[PDB]
Design a protein around this ligand. Structure first.
Ligand code: MET
Length: 523
């Protein structure tokens, strides 16, 4: 019960290679969640960015034979170009090379050391460079390296692992087991979906070793943040990386989305801790185990929710998001990725199924419906009519429209965007059945009063559904509201989740001779 900036993040992505889907997916989920809270009238800060340090990224820049500084800048430019083309509404793009971020990392590091949670030790064990992840012997197995020779690989990811024996600064993660366990249990929604929350607990129950938070300077090709007070060591890319969330919460951003100052105290901008960390299933441990343990050591507040979707947010496997968005449309693609993907990789991403959902749901259910209630043939006055008396059937439909907001609200807040969309379209399917059942095209001649009632209900249903769909279909929801003639003030705010927010007499927006909202793609 504290009014605060709703702070939602994506992961920051390794810039070892171009952006692809998945990066786009993760950022989409972050964008949608942020958008939904904006239509509720809440303050929002959506964060995304790039993870530019590390052995991975340094060695990727070597293979392209160019400077780390030049390489990280260039790939990051590609991430921004991509995210702008994607038409998101993110508030800030962060980069771990940012000088103010570096400052926050060092500040955090010192905090951890002053608390006595960092000591000089050794790590002697396996490491996946591609994952920047330490692994116990039970998490590797036999495999083949890039030359076809025998080697070891992560069971997590199948990437090549190498044995590391280094004197590192070690963090006392073992000491935080009992407090994390308390945290998971006191806050049973803090990790979503449930079966990933159960995975985290089982792992932490088993026992936690201490974590290596530094590495030898040479190993990282001097591409990392120096450990404060020890120039021989660099900060573990993951500590560095996770700290972006804290950095983001402390950056004042200007008109153009550029940082202009870093604040001393996170309370100043009221963002920290994150309300939702959006992540892929591949990085759960860093966020649900390491991250909270660091925060507990530093006396910082823990995030409210971590949601981990069913995608490998990096290095999976030809599905270009821009080329698909130019083919099928931008809101349609976003709708398709959000509708087809629950909390699994079991989704069907063929063109066949993209067309089935476009035509099936977007066109026949949403599109057809929007036309009917604006059609000059049916809505002959091009206005919102005054409803007459309601039948029990009218009420049954109206009831669905009234209950829809609270239900979609809960789903968005889980967060489960698929279930929110499904819940909206269930109401859309019902409105269409109602209209088929009522044949308003016939009512124009036979019963004008009954038409008034039918058409009003259809308009409000289309408005309320379109409102709750506006985070998924941002550009199209604007086109729909324009057709319905909905004033700007009524496109936002929980006030306008209520039935009858737009008054009768409201005039529809101007039409165009060959206009179509969602265009049917031939199979
Ligand atoms: C703190 S989020 C770091 C995520 C990592 N850079 C990745 O691409 O998976």
């Amino acid at each position: 019960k504290v009014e605060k900036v709703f702070f939602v993040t994506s992961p920051i992505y390794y810039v070892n290679a171009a952006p692809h889907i998945g990066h786009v997916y993760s950022t989409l989920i972050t964008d949608v969640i942020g958008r939904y809270h904006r239509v509720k009238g809440e303050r929002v800060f959506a964060l995304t960015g790039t993870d530019e340090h590390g052995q991975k990224v340094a060695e990727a820049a070597k293979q392209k034979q160019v400077s780390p500084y030049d390489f990280t800048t260039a790939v990051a430019g590609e991430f921004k170009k991509c995210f702008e083309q994607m038409d998101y509404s993110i508030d800030y793009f962060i980069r771990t090379t940012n000088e103010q971020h570096k400052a926050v990392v060092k500040e955090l590091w010192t905090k951890l050391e002053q608390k006595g949670d960092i000591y000089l030790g050794r790590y002697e064990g396996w490491y996946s460079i591609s994952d920047e992840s330490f692994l116990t012997p039970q998490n590797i197995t036999d495999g083949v390296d890039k030359d076809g020779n025998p080697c070891k690989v992560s069971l997590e990811s199948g990437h090549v692992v190498t044995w590391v024996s280094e004197e590192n600064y070690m963090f006392r993660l073992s000491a935080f087991r009992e407090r994390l366990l308390e945290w998971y249990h006191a806050n049973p929604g803090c990790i979503v979906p449930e079966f990933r929350r159960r995975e985290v607990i089982r792992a932490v129950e088993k026992g936690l070793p201490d974590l290596s938070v530094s590495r030898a300077r040479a190993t990282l090709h001097n591409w990392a943040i120096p450990v404060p007070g020890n120039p021989d060591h660099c900060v573990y890319v993951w500590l560095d990386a996770l700290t972006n969330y804290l950095t983001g919460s402390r950056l004042r951003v200007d008109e153009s989305g550029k940082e202009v100052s870093l604040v001393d105290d996170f309370n100043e901008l009221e963002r920290f801790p994150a309300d939702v960390h959006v992540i892929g299933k591949d990085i759960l441990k860093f966020h649900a185990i390491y991250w909270p343990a660091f925060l507990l050591s530093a006396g910082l507040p823990l995030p409210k929710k971590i949601v981990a979707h069913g995608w490998w947010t990096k290095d999976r496997k030809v599905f270009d998001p821009v080329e698909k968005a130019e083919e099928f449309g931008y809101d349609a693609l976003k709708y398709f990725l959000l509708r087809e993907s629950g909390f699994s990789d079991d989704g069907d991403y063929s063109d066949k199924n993209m067309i089935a959902r476009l035509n099936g749901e977007l066109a026949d259910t949403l599109g057809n419906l929007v036309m009917r209630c604006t059609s000059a043939k049916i809505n002959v006055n091009g206005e919102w009519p005054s409803p007459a008396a309601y039948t029990e059937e009218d009420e049954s439909l109206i009831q669905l429209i009234k209950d829809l907001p609270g239900t979609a609200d809960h789903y968005y807040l889980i967060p489960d965007i698929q279930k929110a969309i499904i819940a909206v379209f269930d109401v859309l399917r019902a409105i269409n059945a109602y209209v088929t059942d009522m044949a308003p095209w016939k009512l124009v001649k036979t019963d004008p009063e009954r038409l008034r009632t039918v058409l009003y209900i259809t308009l409000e249903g289309v408005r309320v559904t379109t409102l709750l769909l506006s985070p998924i279909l941002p550009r199209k929801s604007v086109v729909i509201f324009d057709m319905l003639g909905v004033p700007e003030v009524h496109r936002k705010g929980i006030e306008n989740f209520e039935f009858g927010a737009v008054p009768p007499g409201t005039r529809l927006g101007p039409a165009v001779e060959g206009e179509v909202l969602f265009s049917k793609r031939s199979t």
